[PDB]
Amino acid sequence: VKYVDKIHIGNYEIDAWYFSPFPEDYGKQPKLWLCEYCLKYMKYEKSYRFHLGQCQWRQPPGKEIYRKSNISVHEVDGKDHKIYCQNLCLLAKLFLDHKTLYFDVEPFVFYILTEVDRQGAHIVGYFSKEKESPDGNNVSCIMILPPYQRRGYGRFLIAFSYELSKLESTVGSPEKPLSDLGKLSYRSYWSWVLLENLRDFRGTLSIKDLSQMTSITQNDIISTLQSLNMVKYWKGQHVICVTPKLVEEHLKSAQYKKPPITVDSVCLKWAPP
Template identity: 55%
Template structure:
């Protein structure tokens, strides 16, 4: 996990590393002894209530504002032996984690408990059926989560249930909750077979499994091979268990991804790096077999060890190459994750700028859509964000000075990995009778 951006350091006189029980260091290095009243005040705060806001020492040894999301009693016998699950309020939920009391600066406590937090917790004691419905939000209608559903989703998924996974040669810290079957609730770490994606509780189970598993690549058809990169198309109906396992795995790294119990309706495109040991998954995207809304991508994920290598934009580009083969325009299903949105904006920007430069901006939005398979609304939004669109006489007109295009192209950076269409062997999906 990368370092936090622009972290705020808590000034405690000794580099921000004072534990709550340590004596304070005053000006000139003098030790300030706490009074009995101060000690009693500290004791009266404990255990901290859910909703408390306080400063917390992160792994970079700097203090950051957090909100207590949950707490749990430690096995030891002391009355204040609790761990706290905290959300770093400056940053994304993927950094949420369990911390010990000594990481918290009790002098910085701002709010003892959020309003109505107890009522909210009580109202969200859900049945298993209700919890399943949350996981299936927007499967049928594909609508964005409304405010109530979002709150319900965040309450149910507020605490990560799996801290780390082992996948191939990588141990990966997870980012979000994933609704694994109940028998895995007590597992801090899960072990995945990197080829069939079956998951196990113990390393020995994985080792035994690997001696029997004869897969060396995702189950499905290889539709692309270029150098060491390979893409496999996996039909969720033919490979249901693999599709479900892939969804469990992906949810650990996607906040609002729906867990699709009915994977029959989807095709999964799994990107792999290949070597003499097999084809190792680096990321994937899923696609509905039939989409009335012109969605050419449902979910997209590049696994953390392979991020910042251009694979996200490669997956996006691949989805549009499939749309071109189908003779359709496409757009990703919303809502996009924060990282997914960044990848799409980068891809749209680069593709459109390249074409505008070649055509000296003498091209219409419809022509751009026909050439790229990008939906007209996405093209319009991208060009508007780059201030390359003007509205004249009732229609949108592309206005791009070559110097402006060059400046935007430079800011967009290099194109990265490209899809060699000559290596794509694929025909659009047709339901077999």
């Protein structure tokens, strides 16, 4: 171990995927030990165990803006909770090749997804978002920790990010480049959402209509619809072209059959800043 290559967080030991610039001294130990509630990183099992008996945090800081049953989202502003956000960024960089910002967190707001039991709210993943995005990015980085990947939580967070964009009356797209798992996940999310809308209306949904209803950009609707072969091109304009039956054929594919953890807008508490 000369870079950090293994973390212990909660009950999980996880191998790193990429370099993250924890301080040199921390990379020297066999494992880096993180408090799963405050995200403090520690060099020894003994300092970790002492910290677990002392730390009073049982959930992320900031404001719980979503709660439904034992699923919750906390909104944490990088200026109000700098240390927690820097800790989160160095933890994320272990799984993200392309994240480059770890310390200058004050331009960002972080949305932390947790799953709650009688012990406290256990981190699953997060996304960051620029407070002011000139490019209309509604996610900067998005990361689900390995033991929760491919289990519905990424789909919930991507949906969540578009729920905020809807409340802001704006469209938005993730910042590129996307990670490999992020690309597959966005493509599957957009397809599901657009197909479900195409099934529910009939029904002069234009591409514009779909962008207003979903907060998905026109370009990302178009590239999705191209991949489904649901668009024709006429004198310089992409136009929707699909039958009710074709929409149902798509939606009967294994990929759309897992039951989603849904985002209930009744349980989201948030207004634009």
